[PDB]
Design a protein around this ligand. Structure first.
Ligand SMILES: Nc1ncnc2c1ncn2[C@@H]1O[C@H](COP(=O)(O)OP(=O)(O)OP(O)(O)=S)[C@@H](O)[C@H]1O
Ligand SMILES: Nc1ncnc2c1ncn2[C@@H]1O[C@H](COP(=O)(O)OP(=O)(O)O)[C@@H](O)[C@H]1O
Ligand SMILES: [Mg+2]
Ligand SMILES: [Mg+2]
Lengths: 97, 195, 484, 96, 137, 200, 173, 275
């Protein structure tokens, strides 16, 4: 949401998952995003709808995206002797999507 | 108890229709029960006169009780003659009377609403006037008479009231309100006059 | 415009509209309406050439949630549908009908559906003579492993409830949840704009992804959940708004899965203060049971292969389910008609059960030597009271008998006591296991009084029962070595 | 312009595959197998049916989706248990 | 015969209801085992509510009501039994409580055995959650 | 005071009143409020014992006319008020029972556990009294018949519940389920009231 | 004023402000002191079925004070806008109690006000009872006025509305 | 006409008129040996326990005498109470009661209040068209009380203002070319939570409270409430709460929702003993 510089009221503008609605969203270096930035795609990747309730703007956008993300194992090399959960920093709620 | 709550001190509209159906009406028979000079079972009823029924001659107007006229009109064996007050000219005259005298009701028969409903439902093809106009004038009379009633229910004292020329169905529907508001305004008065 | 009708990658579009005379004060923000109007044109002087601002002049509004207030703060229910509701309330299986019709596509989760029914009906509000008021709304928290259909339940509750707001924990700020002070572009004067907890007033707000909220945003719900008022002192404004909303929040324990190896307090990052507001705190788990997995798979496949559109319709027409448009009306009618109050026999049961619950929590805390993450407080006694009153309310019973108390106690034991009962000295346990393994033979049994003489809480016997090496059979009076 | 339907299918095979996936996930595994991974099989089968522009998901388009899902699950396991898991799941990918 | 009588289950508030299919049609259900002792307790409780109060007028407090009370006197109607821990107790539909049978004066004109429903009287103690019975009959 | 239990009793009686009014669900009288009846009856016994205690204490003791008259008078008034509340509750229940008996003498003879023993005996004898009335002199007319006027002689009906075959006065009716008749309204009134035929 | 009339029974059981006149001994069973008597010149709230009798038998034992529901404030409210008065909150049985008060005290001025109030409110409740909803395929004013009727007017309205509904149902069948 | 109904009683002024009978009754009750206990226990009858907190609240309602000494010295006569304790110990219900009872009380919350909103906001007048000060939530409560719920949640930038007010009882404004000194002679009662979820008796009462000692020093009484799990006390509290929840208003039937109309405006304008 942003304060419109001309009309001076809060307005809602979409991001990557809205510009890619009914398309594909490509997230290179998935494991290097901040956790509090990576958790923001949990709803739009399963429910396929972005819910915003900021600055008095209560609305639920629609984002029918299809995330394709490229990750990188811990340490730079995939250790085949360890399970998957021990090779990545991602958790179950984001790995299950 | 024996008598249900909604039948305590009033008549259900079905009972009003029952009362109205006992009034004589004039019909044109489509059969002929008049025995010739040259068997057959006679009516011999106990709550009315069977004389006009054993002497029916086709297309010769007689008068029979309304609940029998309807019974014959269930088949094609009679033709109910609409009363003279149920014509467009007379309904217009009554409407003009109502619009001219805003203090008193017109002299319509006590069963005008019930009779109009019954004849419109069961004898819809026996009117010399278009029924779509008779309905529109019956409704107009009902509306004017409802306006006059609501402006007289503004005179609900505790002594009495004169609802002259009011019909039977209108009185029946106004009974539980008038007769229960006047009772309270009488109880208040008698409580005050306890000296 | 409807969120399901916006084109691809487009923001929803607004449209100025004008009511007049008897079509005014007919709708409230957030309600979905169908309008019959004249798409007209007016040239507001507020940036092209010969442009004209469009608007619709309303000639008829057909909401589906009643007028201002609920049914205009009274009952606008046609006589035939009121009689239908009365006939419905006398159904001996009304509780099962309501439970079976809450998200019919979600297999299992019977207890959560029952708690959702109680949340939708809500308790009975009280206003004491001395001034303080007691809230009558139920807050439910749904913790558990991912993939357990918590968000689907929240989305369904957002539909069935007459007034509901669906928000996600991530994309939601404190000033956007309760009330936002905004500056009028024309008059330069500050004013409030209601948030999610004001739009959902008189209904339920579903906060999905609860644990993702910023720590300074989740605090703003503390007053609006218990006191049910929003206090604002900003920019020269000083008001105490009203938010009589039930909060149905779905969260996620840290590490995604519950990870019962870790302590129960480690999985839940919510403070005790926030956890105390919630009346029922469900912790669901993935059982990984083959017989249940087959049932879930066969149900989901039937959902996908068009079989739902036939089976659900057949069940609804059979009378074992209620359509959304009918349950919504019934919920509104029950909330505006009945506010049950406890009978003295019910109150005695509630008190004697609260004492038991607190004693159990005390002994668990003493054994673990650490405060329980899930708290049991007087607010939970009021939670059981509200659940009892909602159970009575759905039957339109003016007084809550002991049946409702028994069911409310069962619901609380199935949700909050279950959440609080999760468990991860050791030398004593090892000594006990070794001595009973060597002394008690593999195929025989010994009575428990004898083991007590040998000696505590003796959780070692329960642990061994988990390992299937012993087995308590004769009503707990006989400990039998099962064969391990 | 294509929306394949899952009318003709053997739901028993998909249910058995899902049950086996969960059983091997809980024991000797770490990849989370929820109901989302059951719906993933159906979604991948529908995508495969879209590739042939078909309006109905065939048995081949379902067996291929099952193979894709079980392969992605197996290849993410530790090398110690991968052979056993592949042997256990071989009975569902019969034909390829 | 025992297999041809009328099923009479007592509705707990006030009612004595009547209840009245194959090879294994005689097999009882689990709820029958659950309610086997509950029905017996309800019958005994009705008998007490008809006789004792009209003859002797202390009330019968359900065992669940003894928790917060510290030293008050109560009259309990419960099923005497032995706990799994090996100490005597009374079982009630509302709960159970251990009883200190020492220093008890029983009515000598009765047989007291585990499983028989008794009318104990004593002072509850919350220090160890025990009911110090004084006279049981 | 002393009528609070009676006040609650008559409040519940009002609820039963409007309750049964509600159109015609022919609702069953809410189970007798035995518990409230017992308390107020016990409340009456305490008041009567207080009068007995005061009267004997007045005789042996030196009590002036003032208190001896006034305490007795107030206790008598409280007892009268409790009697009135009990009487109003019982009379409403009796009126509803009479309505049910009159309407269901042609419908059914029925949960009966909602009635006390006295009320059950009252209803059981009242049915016999009604049958005595329907047989003494007014036997020609069906005194238990419908009170709606007989508008139309011939009606058409649809069979709701299958009843095999039922003999009428002259012929016979084959009550096949979901089969429509066209018969005189006279000979099917009892079946329509009972709940086997539906239309009009 | 029937004996078995539940409306009258409930109307009787309403507390009324009344001061005492005698230092009466031994009373007050449930008046905050069972054994301890009631002092003279004590103001107490008593049910009408008790205060009515105690204010006539004897100087009478109990003197009845003007209740708030008939105070000059309520009288002015009645005389100002009879239709828009929330008489259900003032007293759910206002009219029965007013009739009883007039009967007790022969108040020729309270009666002259309550009768006009009843007439003016009867006009409006007839207007609301005779207006029947018609489906093209309840009004806000009707539902917001029906909340301001005592238990007496709520019965007159029910009876008249049922009569109008029956007449409409019969005519248009 | 302007008729100042106030005190949340919906029809009477904040300065309630005192009849001679009322003053006589007040003087009669002032002679009781335990008038303090009666008045304190009568404050919030629905809140079981917390007798000492009720006594402190009553003492705060009639604050001490204020000394306007010479040489500019000013000894405040208002009592400030801070309540920090475990969740659900009626910390906020007591604040709500003080709101509903005190003649002039202003409700405030930690999250929903900024320093500008607590002291003064420089807005612009619309009738005249000029800069003006608007009294904040804690200047409006001058000679009253301020009920700051969730005290510890206040941001540090928004906490310096209340520190200044409790220090010298006047706010100062130095923005938009305005140099005034508004008077805020209010007595603050605040409810706070421990740093962790619940109070920890194993730590000193400094790391349990998330407020600076320079701010806790301005509170006359710092009451620490603990939700200790007992058995007798739990039974007493449960019985009391269940008695409270069974309360039925006079003019209402059982199982009937408590609708509110507040149309008590039948008229506009003025129209020994041991209990
Ligand atoms: N018991 C069930 N019955 C039917 N569908 C189910 C069931 N459990 C899971 N699902 C499906 O599995 C998916 C679960 O996704 P969501 O419920 O939106 O996410 P979630 O369950 O809330 O888990 P989170 O939000 O990541 S912690 C949906 O497609 C559900 O339809
Ligand atoms: N001592 C008490 N007596 C009665 N009720 C209490 C008591 N303590 C807490 N409660 C109940 O707890 C509920 C919530 O209390 P609350 O004001 O939220 O405390 P806090 O703000 O400290 O969480 C209230 O409805 C109140 O009835
Ligand atoms: Mg989710
Ligand atoms: Mg608080």
């Amino acid at each position: 949401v942003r304060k419109d510089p001309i009309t001076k009221e809060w307005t809602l503008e979409g991001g990557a998952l809205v510009l890619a609605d009914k398309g594909v969203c490509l997230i290179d270096e998935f494991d290097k995003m901040n956790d509090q930035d990576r958790t923001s795609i949990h709803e739009a990747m399963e429910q396929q709808s972005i819910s915003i309730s900021k600055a008095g703007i209560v609305t639920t956008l629609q984002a029918r995206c299809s995330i394709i993300a490229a990750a990188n194992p811990n340490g730079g090399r995939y250790n085949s002797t360890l399970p998957l959960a021990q090779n990545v920093s991602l958790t179950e709620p984001i790995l299950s999507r | 108890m024996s008598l249900p709550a909604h039948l305590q001190q009033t008549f259900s509209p079905e009972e009003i229709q029952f009362i109205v159906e006992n009034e004589p009406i004039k019909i044109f028979p489509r059969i002929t029960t008049r025995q010739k000079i040259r068997n057959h079972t006679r009516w011999q009823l106990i709550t009315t006169d069977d004389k006009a029924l054993n002497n029916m001659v086709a297309m010769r107007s007689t008068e029979v009780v309304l609940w029998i006229a309807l019974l014959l009109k269930q088949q094609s064996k009679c033709s109910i003659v609409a009363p003279q007050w149920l014509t467009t000219k007379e309904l217009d005259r009554k409407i003009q009377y109502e619009k001219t005298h805003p203090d008193r009701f017109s002299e319509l028969p006590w069963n005008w609403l019930v009779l109009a409903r019954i004849l419109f439902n069961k004898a819809k093809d026996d009117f010399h006037d278009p029924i779509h106009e008779l309905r529109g004038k019956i409704q107009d009379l009902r509306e004017i008479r409802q306006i006059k009633v609501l402006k007289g229910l503004k005179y609900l004292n505790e002594s009495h009231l004169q609802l002259d020329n009011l019909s039977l169905l209108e009185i029946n529907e106004l009974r539980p309100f008038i007769t229960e508001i006047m009772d309270k305004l009488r109880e208040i008065h008698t409580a005050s006059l306890t000296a | 415009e409807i969120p399901e009708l916006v084109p691809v990658g487009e923001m929803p579009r607004n449209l100025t509209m004008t009511c007049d005379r008897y079509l005014t004060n007919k709708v409230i923000p957030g309600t979905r309406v169908t309008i019959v109007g004249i798409y007209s044109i007016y040239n507001s002087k507020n940036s092209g050439v010969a442009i004209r601002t469009p608007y619709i002049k309303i000639l008829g509004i057909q909401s589906d949630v009643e007028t201002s207030s609920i049914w205009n703060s009274v009952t606008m229910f046609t006589e035939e549908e009121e009689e239908e509701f009365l006939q419905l309330s006398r159904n001996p299986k009304l509780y099962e009908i309501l439970t079976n019709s809450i998200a019919p596509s979600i297999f299992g989760n019977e207890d959560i559906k029952k708690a959702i029914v109680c949340l939708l009906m809500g308790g009975s509000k009280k206003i004491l003579p001395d001034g303080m008021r007691l809230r009558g709304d139920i807050n439910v928290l749904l913790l558990g492993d991912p993939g357990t259909a918590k968000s689907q339940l929240l989305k369904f509750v957002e539909k069935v409830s007459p007034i509901a707001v669906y928000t996600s924990g991530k994309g939601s700020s404190a000033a956007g949840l309760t009330a936002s002070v905004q500056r009028d572009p024309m008059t330069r004067e500050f004013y409030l704009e209601g948030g999610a907890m004001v739009l959902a007033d008189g209904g339920v707000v579903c906060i999905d992804e609860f644990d993702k909220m910023r720590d300074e945003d989740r605090v703003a719900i503390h007053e609006a959940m218990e006191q049910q008022t929003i206090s604002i002192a900003k920019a020269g404004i000083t008001t105490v708004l009203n938010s009589r909303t039930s909060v149905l929040a779905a969260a996620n324990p840290i590490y995604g899965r519950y990870d019962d190896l870790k302590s129960p307090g480690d999985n839940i990052d919510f403070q005790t203060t926030i956890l105390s507001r919630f009346d029922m705190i469900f912790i669901v788990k993935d059982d990984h049971n083959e017989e249940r997995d087959i049932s879930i798979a066969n149900h989901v496949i039937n959902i996908h292969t068009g079989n739902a559109n036939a089976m659900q319709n057949q069940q609804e027409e059979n009378g074992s389910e209620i359509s959304i448009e009918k349950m919504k009306r019934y919920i509104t009618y029950c909330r505006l008609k009945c506010a049950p109050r406890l009978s003295p026999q019910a109150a005695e049961k509630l008190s004697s059960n609260f004492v038991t619950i607190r004693k159990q929590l005390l002994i668990n805390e003493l054994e673990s030597t650490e405060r329980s993450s899930i708290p049991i407080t007087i607010r939970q006694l009021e939670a059981i009271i509200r659940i009892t009153e909602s159970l009575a309310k759905l039957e339109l019973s003016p007084i809550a008998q002991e049946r409702h108390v028994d069911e409310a106690i069962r619901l609380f034991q199935a949700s909050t006591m279950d959440a609080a009962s999760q468990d991860p000295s050791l030398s004593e346990i090892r000594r006990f296991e070794q001595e009973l393994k060597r002394r008690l033979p593999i195929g025989w049994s010994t009575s428990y009084q004898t083991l007590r003489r040998e000696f505590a809480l003796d959780k070692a016997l329960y642990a061994l029962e988990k390992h299937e090496t012993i087995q308590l059979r004769h009503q707990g009076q006989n400990i039998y070595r099962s064969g391990v | 312009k294509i929306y394949p339907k899952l009318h003709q299918m053997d739901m028993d095979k998909v249910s058995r595959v899902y049950a086996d996936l969960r059983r091997e996930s809980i024991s000797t595994g770490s990849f989370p197998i929820t109901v989302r991974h059951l719906e993933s099989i159906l979604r991948i089968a529908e995508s495969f049916a879209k590739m042939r522009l078909s309006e109905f998901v065939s048995s081949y388009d379902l067996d291929r989706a099952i193979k894709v899902v079980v392969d992605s699950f197996v290849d993410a396991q530790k090398v110690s248990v991968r052979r056993q898991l592949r042997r256990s799941f071989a009975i569902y990918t019969l034909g390829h | 015969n025992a297999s041809q009588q009328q099923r009479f289950s007592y509705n707990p508030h006030k009612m004595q209801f009547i209840f009245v299919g194959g090879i294994a049609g005689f097999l009882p259900d689990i709820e029958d085992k659950v309610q086997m002792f509950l029905t017996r307790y309800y019958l005994t409780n009705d008998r007490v509510m008809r006789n004792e109060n009209f003859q002797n007028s202390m009330s019968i407090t359900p065992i669940k009501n003894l928790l917060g009370r510290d030293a008050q006197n109560f009259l309990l109607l419960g099923l005497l039994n032995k706990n799994f821990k090996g100490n005597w107790s009374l079982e009630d539909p509302s709960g159970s409580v251990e009883i200190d049978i020492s220093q008890t004066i029983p009515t000598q004109g009765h047989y007291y055995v585990p499983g028989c429903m008794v009318l104990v009287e004593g002072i509850y103690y919350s220090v160890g959650n025990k009911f110090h019975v004084t006279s049981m009959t | 005071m002393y009528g609070d239990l009676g006040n609650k009793l008559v409040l519940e009686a009002k609820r039963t009143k409007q309750l049964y009014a509600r159109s015609n669900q022919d609702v069953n009288l809410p189970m007798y409020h035995e518990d409230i009846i017992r308390n107020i009856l016990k409340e009456v016994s305490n008041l009567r014992k207080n009068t007995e205690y005061l009267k004997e204490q007045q005789q042996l003791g030196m009590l002036d006319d003032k208190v001896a008259k006034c305490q007795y008078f107030v206790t008598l008034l409280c007892m009268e008020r409790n009697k009135r509340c009990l009487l109003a509750y019982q009379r409403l229940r009796t009126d509803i029972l009479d309505s049910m008996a009159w309407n269901n003498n042609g419908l059914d003879l029925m949960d009966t556990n909602n009635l006390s023993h006295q009320e059950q005996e009252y209803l059981k004898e009242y049915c016999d009294l009604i049958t005595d009335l329907k047989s003494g002199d007014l036997v020609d007319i069906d005194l238990s018949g419908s009170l709606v006027p007989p508008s139309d002689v011939f009606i058409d009906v649809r069979v709701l519940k299958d009843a095999g075959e039922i003999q009428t006065e002259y012929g016979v009716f084959n009550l096949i389920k979901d089969s429509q008749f066209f018969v005189r309204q006279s000979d099917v009134e009892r079946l329509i009231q009972q709940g086997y035929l539906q239309k009009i | 004023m029937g004996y078995y009339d539940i409306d009258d029974v409930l109307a009787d059981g309403t507390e009324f402000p009344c001061k005492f006149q005698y230092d009466i001994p031994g009373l007050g069973y449930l008046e905050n002191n069972p054994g301890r008597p009631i002092t003279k010149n004590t103001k107490l709230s008593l049910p009408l079925w008790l205060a009515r009798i105690l204010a006539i038998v004897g100087v009478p034992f109990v003197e009845l004070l003007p209740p708030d529901m008939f105070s000059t404030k309520v009288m002015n409210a009645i005389k100002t806008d009879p239709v828009a008065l929330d008489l259900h909150s003032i007293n759910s049985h206002f009219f029965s109690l007013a009739i009883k008060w007039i009967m007790l005290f022969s108040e020729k001025e309270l009666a002259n006000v309550v009768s006009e109030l009843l007439l003016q409110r009867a006009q409006e409740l007839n207007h609301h009872a005779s207006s029947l909803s018609i489906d093209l395929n309840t009004n806000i004013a009707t539902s917001t006025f029906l909340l301001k009727l005592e238990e007496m007017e709520k019965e007159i309205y029910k009876k008249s509305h049922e009569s109008y509904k029956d007449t409409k149902r019969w005519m248009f069948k | 006409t302007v008729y100042p109904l106030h005190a949340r009683s919906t029809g009477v002024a904040a300065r309630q008129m005192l009849t001679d009978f009322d003053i006589r009754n007040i003087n009669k009750l002032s002679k009781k040996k335990d008038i303090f206990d009666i008045l304190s226990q009568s404050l919030a009858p629905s809140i079981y326990g917390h007798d000492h907190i009720k006594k402190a609240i009553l003492l705060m309602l009639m604050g001490g005498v204020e000394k306007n000494l010479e040489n500019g010295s000013h000894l405040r006569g208002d009592i400030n109470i801070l309540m920090v304790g475990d969740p659900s110990t009626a910390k906020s219900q007591l604040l709500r009661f003080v709101l509903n009872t005190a003649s002039l009380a202003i409700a405030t919350t930690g999250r929903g209040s900024s320093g500008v909103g607590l002291t003064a906001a420089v807005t612009t007048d619309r009738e005249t068209g000029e800069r003006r000060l608007e009294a904040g939530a804690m200047v409006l409560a001058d000679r009253g009380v301020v009920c700051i719920d969730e005290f510890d949640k206040m941001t540090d930038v928004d906490r310096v203002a209340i520190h200044e007010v409790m220090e010298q009882q006047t706010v100062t404004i130095a923005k938009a070319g305005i140099h005034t000194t508004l008077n805020a002679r209010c007595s603050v009662i605040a409810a706070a939570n421990p740093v962790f979820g619940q109070y920890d008796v194993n730590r000193d009462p400094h790391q349990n409270i998330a407020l600076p000692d320079s701010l806790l020093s301005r509170f006359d009484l710092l009451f620490v409430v603990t939700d200790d799990i007992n058995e007798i006390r739990d039974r007493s509290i449960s019985e009391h709460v269940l008695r409270t929840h069974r309360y039925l208003p006079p003019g209402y039937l059982e199982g009937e929702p408590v609708r509110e109309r507040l149309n008590l405006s039948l008229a506009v304008g003025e129209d020994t003993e041991i209990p």
